[PDB]
Structure 1
Amino acid sequence: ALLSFERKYRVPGGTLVGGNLFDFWVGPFYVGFFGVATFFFAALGIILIAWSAVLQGTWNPQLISVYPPALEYGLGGAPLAKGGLWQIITICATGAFVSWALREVEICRKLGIGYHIPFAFAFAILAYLTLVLFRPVMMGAWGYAFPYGIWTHLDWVSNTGYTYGNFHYNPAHMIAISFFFTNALALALHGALVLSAANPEKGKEMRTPNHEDTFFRDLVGYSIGTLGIHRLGLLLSLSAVFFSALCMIITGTIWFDQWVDWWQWWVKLPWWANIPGGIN
């Protein structure tokens, strides 16, 4: 079925590959060549994971866990049982995500809109690739990737973090967090503002953009604007993921000890390094 105003948009075209071959819809979902590719990669990965569960001995979601090759395999292949399955699932994941993104590009073309969404999504994909491809390679071992388990991957986050003491000290990490907190702050603010205008005090007429602007202007002395609040949201979100990837790509590659010791470059700076007093 379609939305009461949909028909006029379901026209031919927009495809990047295969022409009109896969240019059709299945219910609400649009397919296209990459819709097919997504299914393929998705199915293959879910099947290989289900297969990894058999060899493991459970169908318990909270226990299933596909680990990457042991450090013993460096960047080489590994028996489907000791890292291979992971390797091939990681391949299916990357192939599914990327296809998913290319699938949004075709939809953008058929709808005549900008490519901001898939472009934004690619930042998510790159952060993923940083954890399972880039960082592992730079450290020369597939074994540094995180395991695919609902709970086992937190163990990884936990153990990977404590390898360098309290991870809070990773400077790039502080920046990432700041954008994550700021973005949620901004999301709640934007949502509330648009809502406070469309749904004013009972009985009154819905407010106008000028009200949104004056409310915020009265509250903090500034209004970023309707166009600007959306650029901000995208900016805050992508920057959070950019710095997340950055904080990891440098951990274990160019930095190896307790992150807290890195802050010494500032404490031991020649001019004030030995001045008596304070904490140091």
Structure 2
Amino acid sequence: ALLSFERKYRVPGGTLVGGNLFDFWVGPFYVGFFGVATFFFAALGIILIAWSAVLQGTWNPQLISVYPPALEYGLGGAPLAKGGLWQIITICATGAFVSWALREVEICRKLGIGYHIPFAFAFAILAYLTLVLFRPVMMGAWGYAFPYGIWTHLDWVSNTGYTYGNFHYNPAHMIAISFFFTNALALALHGALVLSAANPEKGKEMRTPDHEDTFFRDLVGYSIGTLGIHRLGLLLSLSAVFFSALCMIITGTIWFDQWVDWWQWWVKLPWWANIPGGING
């Protein structure tokens, strides 16, 4: 039940709420007040999904789908079988996620480490909330939120995107994507570089970070360095999600037409709008 080096870190303290009341572990898992909260929210959420399943009349994981209230309900409550369960499940999700983050904070405090992890996780939570809470509130109905179903959530992505033509033309979406692709590129390179140093050619001694800097300078003329790369991975992944949330919060609110037509502002600039030739003249 403990890693060989683990006991010396399992001291009391670091809790945000409850003092010593929940300051303990179950097997590997730390509990804390927010562990209890996570369990409660997650448990209720999962039970309510099972109830939604019974009302839908299926137990198939590929079929269970919990839909938000239809648009006619606006931002009001809805009967349980008609959107109310979605609404309660969504409060449960939010509670579970935020509790998870706060429990991560208690774990940081006990371990004497920085808070970067739950800070990073809060970006994911904020993206979830953009889709289920902020955007629907700004648009005036819960029904603009996505349903909780493996395939139905994808139907929502497709239907929502094509509401604005080819969603590729959302410029915040272009930036978000560039960060996702760049992030995966940097992840591959970070993983490869460390491993190439730690696992050198057969019979050779482990390489050093000097060799990692060297390899990358040789390759592209620059190395960000061992601190820099971890700063970078963090920035790229959080930027991707920040621009994801941004690209959706502006869609259906400040911009609601076909995204492709947004780009006309550039083509229509007075200095060149009327010059013949090219694609747009």
The alignment's TM-score, normalised by the length of structure 1, stands at 1.00
Q: Tell me the distance in 1 between the aligned counterparts of 2:159 and 2:71.
A: 15
Instruction: Specify the SS of the correspondent of 1:272.
Output: coil
Q: Tell me the distance in 1 between the aligned counterparts of 2:219 and 2:234.
A: 23
Instruction: Specify the SS of the correspondent of 1:256.
Output: coil
Deviations 1:234-278 (A, max 9, x none): 000000000000000000001111100000000001111011110
Q: Tell me the distance in 2 between the aligned counterparts of 1:64 and 1:208.
A: 52
In structure 2, the partner of 1:199 is 199
Deviations 1:181-231 (A, max 9, x none): 000000000000000000000001010110001000000000100000000
For structure 2, which runs of at least 5 residues remain unmatched after alignment? Answer: none
Q: Tell me the distance in 2 between the aligned counterparts of 1:147 and 1:181.
A: 27
Instruction: Specify the SS of the correspondent of 1:274.
Output: coil
Q: Tell me the distance in 1 between the aligned counterparts of 2:164 and 2:270.
A: 26
State the 1:29 CA deviation. 0.2
In structure 2, the partner of 1:44 is 44
Deviations 1:104-138 (A, max 9, x none): 00000000000000000000000000000000000
Question: In the TM superposition, what are the counterparts of 1:26-45 in structure 2 within 5 Å?
Answer: 26-45=26-45
Q: Tell me the distance in 2 between the aligned counterparts of 1:58 and 1:225.
A: 53
Instruction: Specify the SS of the correspondent of 1:18.
Output: coil
Q: Tell me the distance in 2 between the aligned counterparts of 1:256 and 1:106.
A: 42
Instruction: Specify the SS of the correspondent of 1:37.
Output: helix
State the 1:20 CA deviation. 0.3
Deviations 1:54-78 (A, max 9, x none): 0111001111100000001000000
Q: Tell me the distance in 1 between the aligned counterparts of 2:73 and 2:58.
A: 26
Q: Tell me the distance in 2 between the aligned counterparts of 1:202 and 1:105.
A: 43
State the 1:23 CA deviation. 0.2
Aligned-CA RMSD value: 0.3
Instruction: Specify the SS of the correspondent of 1:13.
Output: coil
Deviations 1:20-54 (A, max 9, x none): 00000000000000000000000000000000000
Q: Tell me the distance in 2 between the aligned counterparts of 1:38 and 1:256.
A: 37
State the 1:162 CA deviation. 0.2
Q: Tell me the distance in 2 between the aligned counterparts of 1:63 and 1:170.
A: 31
Q: Tell me the distance in 1 between the aligned counterparts of 2:50 and 2:222.
A: 53
Q: Tell me the distance in 1 between the aligned counterparts of 2:200 and 2:151.
A: 44
The alignment-based identity, stated in percent, is 100
State the 1:12 CA deviation. 0.3
In structure 1, the partner of 2:242 is 242
Q: Tell me the distance in 1 between the aligned counterparts of 2:6 and 2:63.
A: 44
Q: Tell me the distance in 1 between the aligned counterparts of 2:204 and 2:42.
A: 50
Question: In the TM superposition, what are the counterparts of 1:250-269 in structure 2 within 5 Å?
Answer: 250-269=250-269
State the 1:166 CA deviation. 0.3
Instruction: Specify the SS of the correspondent of 2:188.
Output: helix
For structure 1, which runs of at least 5 residues remain unmatched after alignment? Answer: none
Instruction: Specify the SS of the correspondent of 1:53.
Output: helix
